[PDB]
Amino acid sequence: QNARAFEYLMTRFSTPEEVFGPLSERLTSGYLPEAEIVFLDEIWKAGPAILN
Amino acid sequence: QNARAFEYLMTRFSTPEEVFGPLSERLTSGYLPEAEIVFLDEIWKAGPAILN
């Protein structure tokens, strides 16, 4: 009944401020911490900060 | 009868605030969300936030 989708493509130069939300304390309105179903395309090419 | 154009050149340091309009909630007056035909030159060099 209440589910929010999230489509994102992981790149080689992707930053955590564009997946979970940029900070100002972090503007995470509609991203990953408040999403029922998340989609991450091409996960075998992300950075070390997003993997941790 | 009612169509708006949009010409923009994607650079290596382009930000989504200059393509989809800057935020204040987002000043999208004549940019991409309200445009019938959009033109993006050199799309093979944009950032990860604009491509997603």
Side-chain angles (χ1 to χ4, degrees):
Chain A
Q1 281 193 146
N2 182 46
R4 317 167 174 200
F6 174 72
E7 188 201 306
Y8 197 88
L9 171 88
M10 288 287 171
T11 82
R12 293 178 200 206
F13 325 103
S14 287
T15 70
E17 271 69 43
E18 306 153 33
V19 185
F20 313 102
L23 79 159
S24 63
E25 67 174 64
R26 202 160 203 169
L27 297 158
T28 66
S29 194
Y31 279 96
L32 202 136
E34 36 183 293
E36 272 73 29
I37 287 98
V38 282
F39 176 69
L40 310 173
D41 209 338
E42 224 73 38
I43 209 67
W44 316 121
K45 51 160 63 166
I50 322 165
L51 197 274
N52 274 286
Chain B
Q1 281 193 147
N2 182 47
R4 317 168 174 200
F6 173 72
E7 188 202 306
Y8 197 88
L9 174 87
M10 287 288 169
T11 82
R12 293 178 201 206
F13 325 104
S14 289
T15 69
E17 271 69 44
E18 307 152 33
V19 186
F20 312 101
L23 79 159
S24 62
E25 67 174 64
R26 203 159 204 169
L27 297 158
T28 66
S29 194
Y31 279 96
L32 203 136
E34 35 182 292
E36 271 72 29
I37 287 98
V38 282
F39 177 69
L40 310 172
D41 209 338
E42 224 73 38
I43 209 64
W44 317 121
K45 51 162 63 166
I50 319 164
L51 197 273
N52 272 284

